[PDB]
Design a protein around this ligand. Sequence first.
Ligand code: NA
Ligand code: NA
Ligand code: NA
Ligand code: NA
Length: 284
Amino acid sequence: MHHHHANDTVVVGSINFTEGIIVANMVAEMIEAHTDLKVVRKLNLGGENVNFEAIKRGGANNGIDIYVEYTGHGLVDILGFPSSTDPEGAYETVKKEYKRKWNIVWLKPLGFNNTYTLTVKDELAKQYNLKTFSDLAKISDKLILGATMFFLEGPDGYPGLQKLYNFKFKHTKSMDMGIRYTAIDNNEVQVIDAWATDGLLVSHKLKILEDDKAFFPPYYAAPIIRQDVLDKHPELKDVLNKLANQISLEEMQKLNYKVDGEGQDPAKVAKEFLKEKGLILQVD
Ligand code: NA
Ligand code: NA
Ligand code: NA
Ligand code: NA
């Protein structure tokens, strides 16, 4: 699964994915509050690999200098390595390899693991004492999965997950857009797929289950930056590392909800979050 549908200038990128826009705007705000660097906020069109192609180009070549990447995307999709089960091993691997291959520096994780998950209504989890994918698999022969199309079409999706856990859902319905949220609300399906930080989980009274057999890789978000930009502006390392461990899963979910559920401006959501925990000053 993919996370998509001194007066010099630094270019911060994201693609059109709510979480990505929010965290990219946070990165921009931190640079604008703590340095005199000019920040271009580039919204790249296309899938998430456009960010990787852009960072290899660099802001000086109509690309970008910084974006927020997930450890497992770098590990599996970019480097082609197997899906590790250890967050630290995954992080150290991408950090070492990105530095060696492309002179790209992984900074510290933001604090959340936006991994792919299966979710059920809180009420179902309470009724059947569900915590893990393995718990769900045991009762899956009574249940229906409503899932995004890409999750059903791929060995890294439900087919592979089904093999590892022996899922036996009666039906697996392809439901794009917001169809599966309405379906689970209506008890037409009993399980949906979602990113762990999906802004709709709390408002739909949904519970994320644990991938106890570790099918999915770690997906810890962290800023990554070109070394040549750090060479010119070494102060960016400490400025951006002020975000280290500053965004929990629950905090990120709430920000995604403000945008996707409440229609708030992601730039305002990002800046207000930083101001409310003192990461920028009240007058910044
Ligand atoms: Na690195
Ligand atoms: Na993180
Ligand atoms: Na099935
Ligand atoms: Na806050």
